[model samples]
Target: SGTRYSWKVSGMDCAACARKVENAVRQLAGVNQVQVLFATEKLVVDADNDIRAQVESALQKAGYSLRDEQAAE
Candidate 1:
């Protein structure tokens, strides 16, 4: 059982960059599924808990960032 979370990603220059963002979140402990839409720069994640902070940190570490606006609200 997991919750879905979404965010807009920044710094992605192409589809490969979107993959990097997805991979970063997918490697997290509680993450179940991850998808990045390059056209809209959207990132969707399914995880066991609310791991948004961790997800953001992971993406930043991988050279990507999330937009400030709320995506799940």
Candidate 2:
């Protein structure tokens, strides 16, 4: 029912990494929720508008990156 985005985040080696990533996107304008799953290296964001690009950029600045396509393990 809400606009959400998902991505496989890289460089998240621990749970703290996820929190930092969340803080990065949490400041974005339109962002309502930010969830990062460190075990799965997945990032989920809920926002009023499509802030996908902004989230990616924010994460990159926080020393993380997002992948639209997950790589095979």
Candidate 3:
């Protein structure tokens, strides 16, 4: 089953930066939805599995620092 999730990511200053993060995160398996709120530094995602590691890895490799929000809170 899939659940909606949100993560706090720092360093996304503009729409382009947020878009890049979204694109990177969306590449992970089972990710169905991705929304980036650059102003609030939030990334909302919908996926079946716990995507924390996947998200962190994606953002890290792309120069976006993702705060370890917690166990899918």
Taking all chains together, each candidate's TM-score versus the true structure is 0.81, 0.81, 0.84
Quality of model 1 by C-alpha lDDT: 0.78
Model 2, span 1-73: residue lDDT tens: 4577888876887758777888988888788877677778888887778777778888888887677532112
Candidate 3 Cα deviation (angstroms), residue 23 = 0.8
* Full ranking by lDDT: 3, 1, 2
- The true-versus-predicted C-alpha distance at residue 47 of model 1, in Å, is 0.8
Off by over 4 Å in 1: 68-71
**Model 3: per-residue Cα lDDT over 1-73, one tens digit each:** 8777777887997858877898888788788877778678887887887877788888899998777564355
Clashes of 1: 0
User: What's model 2's lDDT at 24?
Assistant: 85
Off by over 4 Å in 2: 69-73
Model 2 residue 8 lDDT score? 88
C-alpha lDDT score of every prediction, in listed order: 0.78, 0.76, 0.80
- Minimum summed lDDT over a 10-residue window in model 2 is located at 64-73
Clashes of each: 0, 0, 0
Model 3 clashing residue pairs (backbone): none
